Write a protein that binds this ligand. Sequence first.
Ligand code: HEM
Ligand code: HEM
Ligand SMILES: CCCCCc1cc(O)c2c(c1)OC(C)(C)[C@@H]1CCC(C)=C[C@@H]21
Ligand SMILES: CCCCCc1cc(O)c2c(c1)OC(C)(C)[C@@H]1CCC(C)=C[C@@H]21
Lengths: 462, 462
Amino acid sequence: GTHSHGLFKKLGIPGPTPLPFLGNILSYHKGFCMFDMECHKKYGKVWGFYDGQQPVLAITDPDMIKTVLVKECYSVFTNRRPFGPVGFMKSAISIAEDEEWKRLRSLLSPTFTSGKLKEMVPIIAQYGDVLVRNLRREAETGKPVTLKDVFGAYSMDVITSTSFGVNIDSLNNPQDPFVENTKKLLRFDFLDPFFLSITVFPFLIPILEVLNICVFPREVTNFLRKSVKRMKESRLHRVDFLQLMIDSQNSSHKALSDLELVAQSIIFIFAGYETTSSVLSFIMYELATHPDVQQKLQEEIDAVLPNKAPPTYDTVLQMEYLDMVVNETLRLFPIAMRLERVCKKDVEINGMFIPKGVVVMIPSYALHRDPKYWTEPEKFLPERFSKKNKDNIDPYIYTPFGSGPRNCIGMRFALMNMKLALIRVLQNFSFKPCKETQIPLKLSLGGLLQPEKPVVLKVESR
Amino acid sequence: GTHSHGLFKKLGIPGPTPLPFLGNILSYHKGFCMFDMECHKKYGKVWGFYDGQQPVLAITDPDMIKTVLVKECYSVFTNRRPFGPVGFMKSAISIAEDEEWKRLRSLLSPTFTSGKLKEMVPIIAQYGDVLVRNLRREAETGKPVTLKDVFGAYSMDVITSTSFGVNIDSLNNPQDPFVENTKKLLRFDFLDPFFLSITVFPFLIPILEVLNICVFPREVTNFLRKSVKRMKESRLHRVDFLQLMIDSQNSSHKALSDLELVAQSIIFIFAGYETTSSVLSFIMYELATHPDVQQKLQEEIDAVLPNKAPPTYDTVLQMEYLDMVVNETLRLFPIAMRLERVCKKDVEINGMFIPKGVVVMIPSYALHRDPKYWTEPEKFLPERFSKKNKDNIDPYIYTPFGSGPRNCIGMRFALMNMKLALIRVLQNFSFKPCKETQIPLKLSLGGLLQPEKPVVLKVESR
Ligand code: HEM
Ligand code: HEM
Ligand SMILES: CCCCCc1cc(O)c2c(c1)OC(C)(C)[C@@H]1CCC(C)=C[C@@H]21
Ligand SMILES: CCCCCc1cc(O)c2c(c1)OC(C)(C)[C@@H]1CCC(C)=C[C@@H]21
């Protein structure tokens, strides 16, 4: 069962020896992050391994990364790895391939412009107030707070109102039928018993397709397909993603059909719910364990927003230290962990031959903690992103949102969404560690970049 | 189980109603040929059906056929339908796809030039003598001859000597180890219990790949892989396909590797063994049931080749009535039956939208027996291809070797190979029907264009 396990030895590329059928997946017992760091340590700039029979070439050269992600993106490295039975979510932009992706990425790009985002801040700002009033209930009761719930409700509060206009206090209505379905849209643990079996038996993916089995629960999508169906029939002015997409199909490319439009609204929740929630928990953990950084940030917030002034789009871009705190956290915790591109031709880039079918991988977690580009990479030093030192940062080493034409389309939204939370939250509360707080934080050995234990902290009102 | 069975009704294309999972394959109980004729009768110029879940759009417009096979061949309709677990025969030119095919088709095109073919006639001519001496043994014994064996041995006699230089009287040595393996390379009956299950369960193809199961018997290819391995080690001048390919890798494209070179030699046998043998049986059946055509051909042969003169390359191209007999037979019996191309993009050709993934099919058998282009299409009238009437023949209606960049690469060889047999055979023997001869001939209801019963005829010596 080693039809292709001799490839990296033929090309003369170092890497760990694979087992038959399994490849190197037994080395995932400590997570993707630990595996990438160690391979980078042993083998250096380029190494290869096997996800079962699938060869994966890892690369850490900034020139090589720019070629893969930007230069030869359209011509060679256009798609990501197929990951399992997807059904009608083939129409989602992150899942679509080749010209279908290029068309979708164009039909949805004006939806994520800064000008469209500025019109969305009054909707995002409203649920910072909901976020604060939910926090104040737990602050004057003295109970340590579990961030992933109060923040998980916030990330859901923003999605429902900016992606459909549904206004729900999901923390005090954690039980409305619309919240039940959308909360079942968590990010995928590719080290769970399922996707590991997908890696060993990729020939089983076409099987699950003909059985209508999907990695997106059919009930959730069936609920949202008819829910959007009823929303579009009711609207027959506002700044919500669904509206901008409805306006898109109301015209070079074919207009977004009805099923394609629903599939995008679903992938926006999938890419934004647990991601936004997890980064906001990582940031508050660092603000708690470094009170000096939390105070300096609170001083800057009140300096731009006197007397707890409500944050605007412009006053958010005005806060440089807040952007430093966010950027430094995303360096330590790049929740995607990896970037992947499927090589679709036989190409030679930067003096290295890469054959068709090989998955090229950029280990983001490993590069963000590389001592050869970062001084004391484990420490939380927001000054790395000061306007003085941000020039010395290579944009292909620090890729928390990826790079190139296939980078995070919701990057501006995700950063504004997180910053509006921190501003309103730090305007009202200080965050101090608890005896039950895991210090130092340990990561999950699974397939998602998340804390081993949920981050619990103390919340005091200023 | 009808995820895509609504496609042709959405596009408004007529066709037979499909059953869940099965599609229209139950209509194959009378063969592909009967199914194409009837659909052409009911629905007209364009219709659609389903091979399970796979939509197949049939087209019969000459302008549309030229677009599919020539104009938009490289850009859209480059590949044929995937057909089952293929293994290392992915490297065969007929199986390869996209740029890999374009590269192989270039590395092998100078191998099939007329100039290379002229140097192969002395090898092909030698086994016409072997073919005659095998026929003479059965002619003066009065036994009716089964053509598919005496001709099957001839088509194998030509392949072994022109593809490897192996000189075997496969009719009197039907038992050498080299003949045993190569005779297991028959054309595929896509209506047998296997490939019908492949059509219903295409998700099972990736399964059979990981089990090393291949539609080419592993023992045969393993025998030939090491046999060619020993042939190339022994050669370390002649006009054999293996030599021309060995010369190709002895240099814009990468040279043919060792496994690719073996895979081509195998696909040449697969495409040439039963095909050449079956056409030669169809021709002799028509020469037997139309003695007037057989006499006129024998008169032309002796007029170009006096006193049973051995046929040269030039004297073969000199015989126009022989070319008429061959062409008229290939019209009645286009052994490929169909041409197929997978639509790889969303394209609109000649005012008709065709979506990505649909297999476009050209029903050759049906078009060759279309009364709207042929007068009395069932009758064997070689005068249709007379130099006077051959101008009125549309090259996209009569496609026995296909058309466009992906047509039969061995067309010139196959025609010369068959004609050299008929010349030498008609120089020595006349062929008269037997009481056991099936008159009129009935075709096999299976998935191969072949007689229902083997053609048995009487052979008398002139
Ligand atoms: C903390 C928040 C987020 C982080 C860290 C993040 C990170 C990423 C990364 C690393 C990628 C892959 C880039 C690449 O492959 O080069 C990506 C893709 C993507 N993200 Fe985000 N993301 C976040 C939030 C969001 C949000 C709020 C949206 C809202 C729509 C979103 C939508 C997408 C989409 C659609 C893609 C795929 C784009 C394509 O394939 O063309 N993400 N994200
Ligand atoms: C009576 C003899 C033969 C007939 C009727 C025949 C017919 C055909 C047809 C209809 C096609 C497909 C064309 C298309 O898809 O448009 C084809 C393809 C092909 N044939 Fe033949 N063939 C014959 C003999 C041979 C021989 C002797 C060879 C020797 C090498 C050969 C090699 C091939 C190859 C390699 C292809 C695929 C080419 C490609 O995919 O680029 N065939 N043949
Ligand atoms: C087995 C092959 C794995 C590839 C599957 C895969 C991996 C992956 O990291 C992502 C996928 C999909 O979908 C999108 C929506 C792009 C996500 C956006 C946000 C982040 C943090 C993760 C992205
Ligand atoms: C289920 C999809 C069916 C496609 C498989 C398929 C169909 C087909 O008609 C042929 C295939 C392969 O291979 C080659 C070598 C091109 C053959 C050449 C000679 C003739 C008569 C048949 C050709």
